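User: hey, got a sec? need Triacylglycerol lipase folded
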Amino acid sequence: ANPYQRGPDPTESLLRAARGPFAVSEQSVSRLSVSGFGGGRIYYPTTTSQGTFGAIAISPGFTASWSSLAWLGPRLASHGFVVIGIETNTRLDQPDSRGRQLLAALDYLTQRSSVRNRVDASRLAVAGHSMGGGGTLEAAKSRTSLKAAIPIAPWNLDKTWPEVRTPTLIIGGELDSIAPVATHSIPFYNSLTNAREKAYLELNNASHFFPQFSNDTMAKFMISWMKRFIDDDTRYDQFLCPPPRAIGDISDYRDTCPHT
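Assistant: Yep! Here you go:
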């Protein structure tokens, strides 16, 4: 009934496994071959029989390469998404620049890439770590048609985001000293007054570098948010609403349930 629904009815175990239910193919994008971002890598479900998929562009942080987040490529793509993980024009690009580069990557993916026919160009998303998470907010501010945004330990000197309409999940690290949640993540979250839905997931005792290593709780919520909002897949609301208890590896969760 939902034309964008993909994959089996979900469970906690399905979300916590190293791969979701789709085999993944990959394609390198050389820096020599694109303008407006530094190239990167595309990850996509090999099969086309279940339809096209939504897509997400993902940015690393200041000083970092895509390899700092590369485990996300196959893991997210294997749940039924096309992922373009970017290298930035230089390692020292600022958040606003990273936002423009995320949009340039989505435009390349849908307009020119050799996997464009696999992507539903109407169902796009952004995510990123640190300044890449700041850039995730910038991209959502510039492109209100984006269906999901996931800033991860985001860093940005711009603290307010009233233009953002996209459903936004901010994932923070409780003990982050580089982008402290009290001055980055939480102010961003409170400022998302026009986001259609939003959530804040705070990982107990986590440092700034929690995303550089496979993290099942992080992946569970990122995948659920992507499913719910990129695919309109209401089956994944079970993991989001009511909100999870702040226990174990979750030190805080803030929500806008119900997701109408």
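Quick note: The two ends are 17 Å apart (CA to CA). Let me know if you need anything else on Triacylglycerol lipase.
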